[model samples]
Every structure is written in structure tokens, then in C-alpha cells.
Target: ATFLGLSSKQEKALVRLDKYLNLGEIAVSLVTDSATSIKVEGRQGYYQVSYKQPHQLYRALALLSAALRSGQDEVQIEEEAAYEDLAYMADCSRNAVLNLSSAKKMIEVLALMGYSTFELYMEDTYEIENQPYFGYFRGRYTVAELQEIEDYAADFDMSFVPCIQTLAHLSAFVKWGIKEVQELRDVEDILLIGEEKVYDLIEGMFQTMAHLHTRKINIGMDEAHLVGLGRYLIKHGFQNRSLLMCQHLERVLDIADKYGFNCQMWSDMFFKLMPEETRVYLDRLKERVTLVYWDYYQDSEEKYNRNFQNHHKISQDIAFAGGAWKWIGFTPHNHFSRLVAIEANKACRKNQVKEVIVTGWGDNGGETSQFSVLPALQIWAELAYRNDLKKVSEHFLVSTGLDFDDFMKIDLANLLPDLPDNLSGINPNRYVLYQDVLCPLLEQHIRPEKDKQHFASSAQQLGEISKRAGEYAYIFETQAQLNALLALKISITSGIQKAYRNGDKEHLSALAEKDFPQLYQMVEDFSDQFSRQWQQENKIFGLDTIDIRFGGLLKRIKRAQERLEQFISGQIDCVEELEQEILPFNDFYKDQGLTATTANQWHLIATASTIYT
Candidate 1:
């Protein structure tokens, strides 16, 4: 007899269970119920599972497979979902466009986590009609690409909702020198609030993406700190910023309504603009938009509860958006990501929030792989159903077939406490990688021996892990080489600086001739690997940025080596910057206000100053 309630839809889940449990599917049955339940009969080679929905069946199977693999005598689980909508938001902007294959892998893993929806946070990564300049050379998705991903998501019974910016963060279009946006832009990226052209652009965005399956849309209106203070104030005098925000939001909502779109937005602006008066402002937004209370920081349950309570006072339909912490710098902050996601998930459950989104944002250059945050996603997924620590660990192993602890070691790229007063958030990898080799401003704070040994040891361990990474081996291998390059670069630069400080002409000559060449080859090899890996999982559009950064580094190293060679041969008496006393400084400290949005500044300044110096 055929398995009860078995359909083609569950074929993939069955296959995964077979792989995870080595069951070979002797017999399986599923039935609808109020909560999910699984009963295993190891002796009979048969199993029966009860699930309230398709996602629950997947979750139950994950648990069942883990139990069977662990040799449990009897396995039974009865669990109900805490939230109806568990969403994973993938960032496709930030100069790194994920390949459709990578996007499919994300959905496949998230489905096992019982995620019902996927959101592509594409800020101008989709084409608009007649807007040739928009998303130009940015690897924006074509309609066919969007349709393929949407269809793939549907096969997993997940909704692929479009998340686009309607008001601020329009640099992708504004940077093109478009006259309409040129006049409408205020303070970098915020659109001029009262301008009709702003609404026209917003309308065009809606029309372009109307073909998508879901009506739920995320209109990003957060972090427009100077929304009305720039051009709007000059044009219309000093009006209340909150009033202008409301007027702009209402106009955008009217446009979205015409397209039959249900709108959602970040809640920070409302809370920031009118903290004490959010009730009145939320009343203005009631029934028009759903406010997403996004908090990527603050790992405390009490903090999340207070924020959710505050948002609930404003509106009963508050949603919580938690960050996966994958966008700190070059590495994935899995430790912080898990802490924040768990607390946020707990808060959402306690507050009765119906929808929760785990956001994987590529805030700066999008250097880290999305696969790195699978552990974080696994945590959020368990919270949705059972919220057991042991279950979460088991789910991760069965879902990804990778060791959770082994994968989390990737965070060592940035989380090492190398800098003084090193803020928890600031990643020194980018700063260290791009800082001038000859001048070496930020190397002062680095614990000369401890930091170098730490990176070297971490790199070795990652290389060992990559040997058995299976399907995700290339990603781990890439990080291994990247960290290896970092370790070698640190050693070479420190030696160069030490030679310059001691005025050891002969030692400097040997270092330049020997160590500099090795560093150059190291970067070239790492660049090749990095580029290949990026192209494999991401589009070619943003790989050029990596090429340029690595290319710039190569050029600087060559120039620095040439200058040292000249100094050795007595062509120059001294290197100008190196001859001067190198003072201890914290160039990569958090005191400079480096967040994800501004983290790319480290690269920009590092490259510019190196070329000029």
C-alpha cells in the first residue's frame, strides 16, 4: 500500500530523510492533525508522522531522521508552530548578486527549517521599464530570473516576496546622474518628500515588480536620518519631519494600493521621528501598512520585549525583523547572529507576533557567504516550532549535513580581539587587509605576536575543515585561503615596518626581495580562488569590485617594494612616511562610527590613501 498523504511535493523531503537517516523509505505515512507528531517503528521498518501542515511535516521528518540516526529506540514529537510566517530575507544588492543556484540552496535549507516565505531584499536589483540607467551594470535580475526563483520557491511551498526601497536608499538609481533623481535626492539617498517625481519613481518600481506572485511588499523607509533636513527644508522651509514622512508614506501607499500590494516597512523611522507620539503616528498608518520592528542588535530578551511592547502600543500588527549578523565585515558573526536571533525569536513568540523574518543582509561589499548563516537560520527555525537547544543542534546537522561548531569557526576572520577597545561590531579584517603596507597605520593596535599566531592557527584549522566540507567545501576553502593571506600579509607588513624603524638597510633589502615577492604571490593566488568562488555562487557583475580591490593591493605592494629597493640602493635617503615616527593609532576602531552601512568606507579610504601615498 502507498504511504498515506504522500505526494510529489514531499518527494524531496523524503529523499533528504533517506540520506539523513539511511532509512531507504521502507514505509512512511503522514496525516493532518492539530500538531505535528512522529512515531517510528525501527523493527517493522515503517513510520507514521502527523503534521498540521506541509512545513510541519518537513520539520517532523528532520527531527525523526535525527532521532533515527542517533539510534533512538522510540521517537515521538508533538509540536505546534509559534508563528505562521517564518521568513528568510536574502540581500541581493550591496555589490554581490547571488546566483540562482545559491538562492535555490537557501530555499532548500530554509524549507527544512519550516520557513514559509523568502524575501529578496533587492534595492534596485530588479529591472524597471524604460529606466535603462537604473540597476545598470549591477547584475539586476531579469523577469526570467525572478520567475525561475519564484517558481522554485513555490515548489518548496514558500512565498517569494519582493522587498524594495520606496523612499530612501536609492543610490543605485540616483548615482546614475538621472536628472529626475538628481533634483529629488536629499542627503545622499533620501528622496525629496514632497516632490511628485519621487512618487513617479516609486510608482514605476511597483509596476515593474507587479508580476511577482505575492502581494506582500516591504517598502523600506528606515534610516533616513536626514529625510527632510536637506533639500526639502530648503525648498519648503522647516516643517516637522514626521509630518513630511507621513505625507510621503501615504502617497506611496496610494500607489501600492493601485497595484494591489500590501505594504510593510521598518519601524525605526516612526520611533525615531516621534518617540512619545508614535501612537498618533501609528494611527495615521493603521490599516495602511504593517510596521516591522527590526532589531539586529541587543541580545537581551528584556530589550526585545520592551521594543515589542512599545511597538504593540503603537499597533497590534507589529512584526519583528531580526538580523542574521552576516554583514559585519569580511566574516559572518555567527555568535552574535545566533544570540540576537534567539532573543528576537523568543520576544516575538511571547509578544504573539504573527510574522518573523530572519534577515541575511550584505551591508557593505557582501563579502561573506549566505551559507555561513545557516546555523543562525536553524536557530530561528527551531524557535518557530519547538525552541529546544538540543533539537536546534540536531536540526542543523540533519538539515545541512554539516557540523554546527565546525561551520561557526568561520567567524574567526573578524571576531578575534586584535584591536584595543575593539568594539564588538567593528571587524578589523577589512581595515587590516587594505591598510597601506608601508605606512601600516592600524597595525599598531594589533598584539604583535598573539594576533599573528591567532590568525595563522585559525587559517590552519579552517583548511583542515574545508577538506571534508563536501558540497560547501569551496566556500570554506576560500575563507581558508583568505585568512591565510591575511596572516601572511600581517607578518610581511610587520617585518617591513620593523626594518624601516630600525633603519636596517641590508635586512630591508632582503625582506623586500624575499618576503614582498611571497606576499605578492599569496595575494594573486588568493584572488584567483576568491574570484572563482564568487563567480560560482554569485554573478560576475560585482566580482570586478573584488578584482579592483585586489588589483589595487597588488599595485601598492609593488610600489612599496620599488621604493624600498630604491632606498636600499641609496637612490633615496629615506621613505618619507616610513621615516617619520609611526605613532600608535586605532584606525579601525568603532569610535569612527563604523556600521554595516559605512563599513565600505574602510576600503575606499585605504585604497585612495595608498595610491596617493
Candidate 2:
């Protein structure tokens, strides 16, 4: 353990730090407070570290760890955050509510990276006193649990803002068939405009936020594209939809103001219909809200600067949100996230933006764990304090005790360097896992030996890393097993089809005797590993969705095995399933923005229809 001399008041922060590093608090002899700074110096035997903020305690420990590792007898380091707030918001609403333990770990790690604000984007992942139907059985946080998280973060001197949806993105609420809540529906997923009962529901949500003693709140009104066209239209005969949005916002604003909280929201809802002057009218009562402008795709600072100018003209008070790109599927886009965030933050500095938050959205199933994005935030923190990317790998090892290159290896399951640039963001790990064993649609795109070797090599590398990954060994193991599965399954369908048609009974026997059974067990092992990883960080509420998908996969493999056996015995005419027509996925998937494609109507059930979209 590294010896330290700091006050007993930092004992709690030290307790959190000790989980990641070996530390010993000897006594108290440090420095003064300015901007959440951590100062450290290598002393005679131990170390002399100064930390003013609760979160800075981790950085101080990281400094000593760095000094000790390099065998430096005397060394010093200092870093500070210039922005009023550097924030990270995790998506807990999309069927993956982070358990309290994982949430605390996230706060601890983010704080180490110079982030001051934290938010859990809970569309309905928290429990209100009397709201029984809201987030029911979906692992919604109890009031006590949320309060505990707020205090844990506050102890780190971090702002745990309550981010919730007040307008749209409530797809779960629409399906529960609860009569009282049903009346609140207006269109697709939007709540009814000007409904008094809707305010009652919104009021309950804020009451819980206020109970947490929150100072900042994000009242999400993003992507409500069909706001007034549902129940609102039948009753009012199609009025101006923009006016409807304004009416709903004003009511929500009154409720938020009543709770003594600073409010912010997604700007897209207003940006689509209303102009800059219309926004000025809302702030007339001095009760204006901060519009959160997000552009996660564009990688150029030129585009970010223009968006900043557009936002600056609308309201001087604003915030910027960028994404970590984990929403698509099983694999993460950490490299792309790093590229976009560097430019996005650069532009923010140029525009003198006060607050910036990077979001991790779990769109389809949140299958890619949030922990996968830590390496990306490592660089984000490095850029924030030092305005340099050179130290990212060094600081990542310092802060996380994990290799930067190893974490980046998770992307190998998706992005292949030898492949074309257009193929960078595809999740072959996902669609490949769920694709039919009889007719693998993307198999046509693979360069047999070259691509299979990609996953095999990736699996081998991660398997070695897992032995040394320590507490995060499970994270590496999950992906390692996935690559192993893909390495073998990538061409199983095509191989079986060719062997059967060419009258190669020897090849059929080899596949049936060895490959199919081993594949069945590999799929089983991958499912078990995924379950363990999910349980380690999240509640059991969302694992069932994954369990069901894997269960379906297992049944498909079993049936494919039986069909192969029957064909070998000459009991079947032509191996009907294998004889079926198949198309390359690119022909089936028409979305231009897509990096990879799934099966279509012509290819069995497409597997995607049953899996999470």
C-alpha cells in the first residue's frame, strides 16, 4: 500500500480509492482550495498529496501510483478543470437500470477524470411514492437508493443531476394498459398536450427530484416528432403543434420552478418547429430553461462551431451534449467517440461554452455495457485538463489500472482495419450471433480465412488479458468469448451448405460430430458469461430480455444439428433449410446510415424481428 498523510475527513474518499489502488492515510499535511485541484509530491518514504475536492482524492492516489510504478524518488503533478461543469450522463432507462453499486463505481471513476456533474437518464427508472405503474418491475430505483447515490456523489463534490423525460420517449408507459396513465397519451409516445392529469404525473416526478435535494434537473423533451397528432388532434381538430409544445413546456416549467431547480432540456423538439425569437418569448418571465444542443455524429470542429453559433443566437444560456456511441449494438465505437469528442470539446473551448456533457445511450437493448466507454472518457478527461491527446494512454493506465490498448481491442469484434472504411461501425458480433446458422446473410461479405482469423486473433489476445484484468476480468472475458464464437460461427452456414451439396459425407460427418456440438456449447458459454457480466453491473430486471434471445439461439442451433444429422442419413431430400435462397445483408438493409445489415423477409424470420431492434 502507498503511504499518505491526509486528514481523517477524507477517509470516505480514501475508502473508495483503496478499492482501485493500494493506499494508506498516515496523517494530515496538505494544501488550499481553488478549482477541485489535486497536488502531489514524492516525499522521503511515502507521498505528500493535496486534495481540496472529495473527487480529487482519487487523482492524488493515481499520481502516487504513477510515481511508485516508475520508481521516481521525487515527482509532482497538478491538474484543474476550467469549465464550470464537465458532465457524463449514463442511459439507465433503456431496460438497463444500473444497480447502486455500479452507479457508485461510475461516479468514482468519472470524478477521477475531472468530471463534476453526473446524471442517470431515467425515462422512468425511479420510484415515486404513489406512482405504482411508473417503471414497475423494471428495476426502478427506490427513493432511499437514489438518495444514497446522491449523497455518495456529493461526498465526491460531484453534482448528481436528476435527468428525466417530461414530454416524450416513454414507450414503456404506453404499453402497460393502465387506465389512469393511458389518458395521458397524446401521440405515439408523447403525453397529451394541456392535460391536467399529465401535470399531476410530472409533479410527482419533480417531487422525488426535490426530495433528493437536487440543484440541477434535465427535463428531457427530445425526439417527440409526433407530439400533437394522436389523442390531442382528435379533440382539438389539428391546431398549431408548436403552440401545443409551448403550452406543455410552460406548465412543466411552472412545476419545475415550484421545486426550486434549474432546468434544461433537449433542443430538437423546439428546433424542428419553432425559431430563435419564439424561444426568447419563453424566457420573458425570467423562468427560461437551458436548451441542450447535441450533435454526436459530426467529427469536424467546423460543424460544431456552426452549431454553437446557431445555439448562441437562440439563447446565451445553453449546454452541449455529445455521445459515446454505444447505442447501436453489442460493440462500442470508442475510436469514433474519441475523434468526435476531441473536436466537440475543442469547439466548446473556442465558443467559451460553460457546460458540456457526454452521453452514453443504450438505444436497442443497451447490450454494450457502460463500462466499455471508460477508455473513451479517459481521453475526454485528458483533453479537458491538459488540452492534449498525447497523455490519454498514460492517464488511462494511471486512473483505471487497465491497459488503454486492451480496452480498445473490444472494437476488434466490429471494426476491422483491413476492411473498407464504409465497414468500420458494423456490429458483426451482434448480427452474427443472432443470424440463422442455416443461412448466414453476412457470410457473403466475409473473406473467409482473413475475417475468421480476425476474431480468432482478437479472442486469443483478450483471453490473455483476462487472466491479468483483475476486477474487470469479466468485461474482457465476455468480449473474448464473443470473438471466439464469431471466429467459429462466421462461416458455419456456408460451410455446411457447400459440404452437403457437393456430396462430401466426410465433411458433413466432421461438422456434425465436432463443429455443431462445440458451437452449441460455445453459444451456451457466451450466454452464461454475458449473464454474469450483466448481473455484476445491473439488476436482474433487464437480463430476461437477453436470456430470451439466447434461449432462442440455442433452440435454433439444436434444430440445425438435427437437420444436419437427418440429411447425412439420407432421410431428407435436399436439406430444405440450407437450400433456401439468401441475399447479402447490404441488399436487405436499406438504411443509408447503417454500417452493417440484418436479414430480411425472404430469409426465414430474419432473426432480427424476434431480437431487440
Candidate 3:
């Protein structure tokens, strides 16, 4: 009765943990003097869990359960966090709302993994009063929804910090072409710095998001590429870029102060401008902004140390942000993401950096689910707690009731066979999906024979792993089918192209009649499963875009199927695409690492009205 402050969620979690441990009951106590320690010891017919914070005790109970599951009666441990803030930033701006339910699931998972902070990266995904048009049609979260997220996370002692963009990446807003805000936009998405209305709009964003839990706000000013090169350039007649940024930042800091918020920003622009700028001017950057040094690549300790040391020179209080690699495409690059985080976090501990945030960005379209990267998220949290990968793997299995190896199978969904020792950026699976079927643009960059066999084998392996997957079997099953479908398409495309070149109608008809309908069915199956997964993890909005793409693909396959039937039955003289000698794509491969040009070009080719030259 004296524990009146405990929320219902907290109380239930405690009761559930007590029962799981087979302890008759447990008493929870809060102690504020300790920085970040949780102490669990045996008591009279029950256990007493003490902690300086709620998440501390929550994690204590979690680790205790792991110990007990290994057949231990009692345990005692006191561990302190290396960083003051260990957070997960969920990117809601990338065409997914992460429905309130889905957000709660993420919070719960992170809580178990011992995370203390959560951030929702919203560019324009929240409603603002008096601006009914703001966030319209984007399925923005309501105030009630935001408050609910805060209150729910608070029960687990998690801080729900507001992350928003004050400049750049406002393309979502400008793309609507709203006359009231359209003029505020520079070349593309960069908000005009000199415009008073732009400042007011930024203030509105801060004010609207101030209702949540913490004052630690991420006022993103990261890639304002043409900050002063647009309207500001036209109005002010070619002013110094660094000077414009510093002045604009001062005003945004003032606005944040008005709302009782402290600001953090991406440190890239400052580093970019440091070489030519004066030291006196550069030192002014340390005033109100806490710099966030975010790097998603490079796993080397030397690179991390060098970057951290350089950033510390700019601002002593900098936060390190690492990537979970979910933004690449349909599958999470768990192997690469985990390796980089392990190295990055090691460097963070060596340096005096006090905060670490694992960023899960949905770059292109948020097709991949956050759940798909649980293994990576757990790895980051485990590295924060302890460095032993073996013990961490065991603890993860016990703590989450999941096999770590089974989860790692998700990576196999995308890796192709015989990839180059240096084929780092843009893995082969996504590239293959976009490669032209008949006139493959990346033929010089791909081994067609090896890819066909590799995807076929990968499909079988993924299917076996899918059955072993407990709660997430459906997603893997979908991947398995999609891989199989891709393999068949490759074989069919090759065979038909060869038969056409030899003027052998018999072989082309056999290939089309046997394989074309199967490809169509595979796409239909994948579309249905993908839709189910998307709805279960996200809101109803933005999925229509996916539906349109997949639906278009299915229609094209159907049209091709009809054409094949007509040609086999002598209704047409030839399949037009197969009739021509395909010219190799000129200068097909470029060194633009991981740019969207390759994917976009493939999209245009795939959706063209005519497939032949």
C-alpha cells in the first residue's frame, strides 16, 4: 500500500518477474544516491531489489531471471553504466508511424536490454495546434498518443526525448507545396535561415514537442547543404556560410531555452567548415549546442579514436551515435552493423564520452521492421553492460527467450554468393532485385550463373531457419519465398534470352509456360505476407506506396504472361524484348558508394512502358 507511486505497468512487471523466478514475492525500493546501480539480494521468503532508478531495478530483475533459469538460487551483482545516456533513436520520419503499439514493444525490448533513453525522430510527424495542415496526410501522432508514449516509457524508467529537425530534411513539409511555407524552403528542404516565419515555424515545432518527458532535444541541423546558397544567397549577396549557421543557431538556442530545452545537433557541418574558419569563430560553437558525432560506417578502433579525439577538440561534451543498419533495404545488415558498433562502443569507453545512441534510420522507405534488428540492438546494450560476447550471447538467449543464432539468420536473406572481398557498400541481394531481368545493367558487376544458384540455395537455407524462428517466423518465411522467386526469375530470364538469340521458339515457350505463372504466384504470396508484417508493425498510411509498386510488378508479370501465351499459340510474331540484341549499359558501374542512383535507375528501367531497346 505504501508503494502508491508505482504505475500499474510497473507493478505488473514486478509481479510477473516474481512469479517467473518462483519467489513467493518481491519488494522493490528506490535509492537516488547511487548513480546507476541495481542490487538484488535474498530476503525473508522473497527477494529485495534496490536501485537508484526504475530501469536499474528492472534490469536487475531481468538479469536475475537469467541467473535463476541457469539453476542458481541467489545472486548478487552491482554494475554501473559507462555512459550517462544510452539511448535508441527510432526514425518515425521514414514513411512509418511505428503505431503506438509498435512503439511500446520497442520500449519494452530496450528496457529488457538495459537501455535508459528512447527518442522518436520525427521530422514533421506530430500534430501542432493552429497549424491543422502541418503533418497532414502523414499519419502524424496526436498529443494524446505522445503523452501515452511518455507515460508508458516512464513506468520502465525510460526517458522519451523529442528528436526533431530545425533545418534540412524538411522535404516532407515542402513537398506538400503549401503556399504558406513553400517560400521558406531553399533549393530543397533546407529552411531559409533569414526568414522570420521559418523561425516561428521552428519555435512551433519545439513548443509542440515540449509536452513529452525530457528536456534533452535533438535540434537536427545536420545536412543543410545549401544553407546560404539559395534564398539567403539571393537576399544577402553571398555571405559567409559559417557566419550564417552560427547566427541562426543562436536564435534556435534562444527558442529552445524559452521552452526549457537543451539542444544537441549533428557535428558534421562544423567540422566541414573548421579548416577555413578562424579559431575564435569556431569556439563559439560550444555555447548552447551539444554536438552529436554520428558515424554509421568504419569499424576500426583507430578511425573511431581519431574521430572522437577530433570532435572532443571541437566540443568536450559530444555524444556518439552508431547505426543499427536497418535503413539499407529489406533486410538488416546485422553482421556489419554489429561489428561496427562493437568497435565504436569500445572507443567510446576509452574516450571520456558520456553518452551513446544507437540510431535505426529508415533511409529510403522504412520497409524493414525494427523488430528485425533486435539482435543488433541487444548487442549494443550488452556491449554497454559487459564486453564478453559469449556471456552476452548466453544472457541474451536467457533474457529474451530467443536463440541468437536463429535471429542472425535474417542476414542470410540478403547476402549473395562469391561477393568480392571489397564489395562493402550496397549488398548483392538488393542490387539483384533492381537489376534488369532481360538486359541486366549490372551484368559486368555480377556473376549471373553464381547468383542464380546462390539465391536458390539461400532460399532453402532461409526456409529451414524460418521454421526455427519462434515469434518472427512469418517474416523469414516471406524472405525465403521472395528469394526463391528471384532465383526462378533469373533462370527464366537467362533461358528466354538465349532461346530468342538462337531463334528457338520451342525452348522459349517451355520456359515461359513453366516458370512465368510461378513467378507471378510468388510475388502475390510475398505481397500478402509483407502487407501483414507492415500492418503489424506500422500504421495504415504509406503502405499504399508499397502496394502500388508490388501491384504494378504483378500487373507487368501478368501482361508478360499473356504475351508469352499469345506467342506460344501463334497470336504474335515475337516477344519484343527478346527480339532485339540488348546493348550493354554504357559505363554501367560507378564508384558512387551506396548512392541511390543505381537503385533509382533500375526502378526506371524496371517500370518502363517497353522492355526492348
Which regions of candidate 3 are displaced past 4 Å?
Answer: 1-9, 15-52, 74-78, 272-282, 418-424, 434-436, 562-613
* Residue pairs with backbone atoms closer than 3 Å in model 1 (clashes): none
| Segments of candidate 1 deviating more than 4 angstroms | 12-22, 36-43, 272-282, 417-423, 581-600, 604-613
* C-alpha TM-score for every candidate: 0.92, 0.90, 0.89
Which residue pairs in candidate 2 collide?
none
The digit string of per-residue lDDT tens for model 3 on 1-613 reads 1232466777776554442232323444444437446666653324555666668666766776665556566666566667777899988887877998888777777777788998989998898776666777888989889999888788777898878888788777777656777777776778888798888888888878787767888988875658889878788788766777777787888899999998889887678533345445557666677889998887587898998888876678889999887876567777777778888888999997788999988865677776778888888877887654655665566444667877776776456643332233454455555454555544444555777787788789889988877667877876787778778777776776677778787886776777878887888888888888888888888787678667767776777667767877899887786565554333323553322222423254454455435
Give the alpha carbon lDDT tens digit for every residue of 1-613 in model 2.
5333555656677677665654443332455566456777655555567766556666666656655566665667776654667788899887788888998888888866768878999988888767788888889988899899899888777888878999888877766787887998997778887888889999999888888867689998665667788898888888666666777888888998898887888776555423565555444522388888888877689998997887776667768888777775667778778878888888988888788888988876668877888877777777776677775766677667778888887676776544433222455667767777875656665556776888899899989988888778898899899989987886576678788778887898888889999999999999889888889999889877777778888898888888888878888866776766665566533445443554222223335343343
- Best-performing candidate as measured by TM-score: 1
Off by over 4 Å in 2: 1-8, 21-28, 33-54, 272-287, 419-424, 500-506, 586-613
Residue 248's lDDT in candidate 2: 82
> What are the Cα lDDT values of the candidates?
0.76, 0.75, 0.72
Worst 10 residues of 3 by lDDT: 593-602
